[PDB]
């Protein structure tokens, strides 16, 4: 799997005009968004290639030599130099730099722009897995004065979609409101799977459009494709996906001391046990207990962990009330129907989901990830789809896979008698907490270790004077809530705490 | 630290009477002990074990002198368990043709515990009983027995063929032995046991009488011996001025096999002979080895590779402020979706042990959180060298205790935003009304709960969290079988394991028909090519 993306950005007078002073330039939105997606890709350490192209430019630069088209980058993995190049254009000062070096405002035909993009994809060498182009604009009728240009763009888009590209349009907040219906209704890569009357709304906030683009760009990475067995006869195919995954710090790699070449072990040399090498069949597995030794074959070792074929078999249904949330064991997984294997699966899946939601009950299944693995009992919780105000897929429809702890994982609590509190103290705490209420969006807290380490790597790679000490959001704003709290804390303490402590 | 347990088997003639459709209770109790001692041996704990039998044709109690406590043999004194114990219990033990008073066995056991705990720490002492109460007895000394138990602080549990209250598949959930099949000698025995145990453990006492089949699917055998966890002292701070001394414990932790496998020679069965070497070389053509001093730690930055010495790493690595449990704020419990739980453990948070002030403050906090239906977002740092986490703390109230529960929440880096096509708005996938009715009928038939007594309560028919890991039992059984039968192949899974890993037959039987209807109403075919 190795795909690529093209962030095609328009350079027009509207792109540099801010709707309000508090609002930021849509071009600034675009460039900061691109910086965000590059840094995210670097964090994820993915293999996807990327490139950025501008049109509407006073000065062009491209291989095929169309006017007003600037191929600022070729398809490539993200690099620190690229990030600095982008950061050169953020802010009002960067906008001025872009005006001076690039120059904005000029006629163009979208057809030739798409032609340039198609050529740029044609330049690839590796097996390009997907083909995505995302456009950033606030103009809904690019060819309101050139009907021939509009028709040529239409036919080019049709060909390219037939060619295998996907074009996605990230429209921006504009005076009057963007509407894809006018021109792009037949232009965009409308998913044939379903009628995309539902679509993303006009982008106004950097965070909002960032969520939109990040959700749009990536491809589903099916962790596994198992079989959900209702019984020995009824079976359906589902795709287990994980929506959360602890992003560990990427492991270091060894380098040559001088040349800094990526070095390779390319060696797992054996001993004189068999002499230089050793045959795996000569390697029995054993364990020791007391003075006793027990020895098994590797196949025997694989045998005792065999219970059933990989997949999900259903035992029954249980009301969500009986299931607990504090019984967390490991990150939950997500389940979606997969008709690429069995036909008609999604129909049964959807009916079952609807009925489970109606009955407010969850399915209880015996999970088995891969061959010869002891099973866990897992609860399939129905998960109704939810959309944000901006038509954002907040919650994907389908069944949430939840692990259920075994009695071994359950531990006991040593404790003497408990003690309650006076209701006045409870009310004091209620007021205190209300003084600190705050909405929680899951996309709010960054990992300080990752950010600091990547800042260090950036500074080393860019050879900066010093690494930037990234601020931590996780660290409490202690003085801020001290202000927000006032003297309530002291009153509570004197209510509860004794004079000595 | 270290416990000490003794097992009291009934090996009586009445103990071995297999009613068709059910195994002999002697065999079931044999399986129970097999499981328990398997765990003890392969957990290589330090708790010595003792085994005493009653109902044997002979007797070997130290108190057998005086013509009392007959038919009672002390098969094994308090020693650390060994494979010899397993071999004896599976083979050397045979159903005795005698019936004896289990109270005499209790006297022998208390004597053994008193006379063998000398000079040994034994932070815990506990006794198990595997009887059928089918034999009569004398109610004389039981008062002295319970008094001595209270004085010596000895725990106690009872295991019977039938619980207190279709085919009797061993280890099943729903059915049990016919409660009306008991001989009314077992009635009197049950009454005596109930009154003894209620005298011992109070109202919770009657919760420690398990049926053998029920026992096999529970950890109740280890309930009195397991080493409780160790608290993690720390303070949580709201702002600067406010703080509370607390302790926390790991309540959920994925149990893992302790001893991994060791690869040894097929011939000499020696790990010492085998060892592994490696070479380092440049990835470029004409592969030339690279000695370690020409190797420097480096890092990949996308398409970029940067050298980075470990010393520089330590000098530039992020540094926390030490152990801390500070809060950040509060939000709707609705906001914190259950699916966003991350990490690989949970923490129950308690007021620091023996602090009335901390207890009062924490209880007030918990009650406020509950009443407002809020949750707490905290910054959790286990140690100065550990990566700080952010996670939700929410109140968890209970009749006997109250505590906060903490679960690690994820950062943006751990999120993944995949777009999924809806299902409700899919004209090619909308189920028919008849299909929906069939699904509803199934889900009605395939229920696992039941509103009981019309008290609006929901009695589970399948507690999965009470089921332990079947992998440990299977592994222990295979290891023991190999250790006793080296040349023989691995035995298959025991039937009772499949019993405990399956729902009660009632739900399957009731679901047979709706399953067929669904199979008829949902055309499903595979994909052949591609
Ligand atoms: O049987 P349930 O109604 O599902 O209740 C269980 C069970 O308690 P009881 O059988 O005594 O009611 C657990 O006890 P164990 O079987 O693990 O010994 C108990 O654990 P504790 O006694 O240690 O508190 C656990 O409580 P929790 O999961 O909160 O630790 C609790 O479930 P509830 O929390 O619903 O009472």
Residue numbers in the entry:
A (entry chain A): 34 to 534
B (entry chain B): 6 to 170, 181 to 545
Show me the paper's own sentences about this structure.
The heterodimer Ku70–Ku80 (Ku) is a central factor of the classical Non-Homologous End-Joining (c-NHEJ) pathway, the predominant DNA Double-Strand Break (DSB) repair pathway in multicellular organisms. It recognizes DSB ends through its ring-shaped structure in a sequence-independent manner. Upon binding to the broken DNA ends, Ku subsequently recruits most of the c-NHEJ factors, including enzymes responsible for end processing (nucleases, kinases and phosphatases), for nucleotide addition (pol X DNA polymerases) and for ligation (the XRCC4/Lig4 complex together with XLF and PAXX co-factors). The metabolite inositol-hexaphosphate (IP6) stimulates c-NHEJ by interacting with the Ku70–Ku80 heterodimer (Ku).
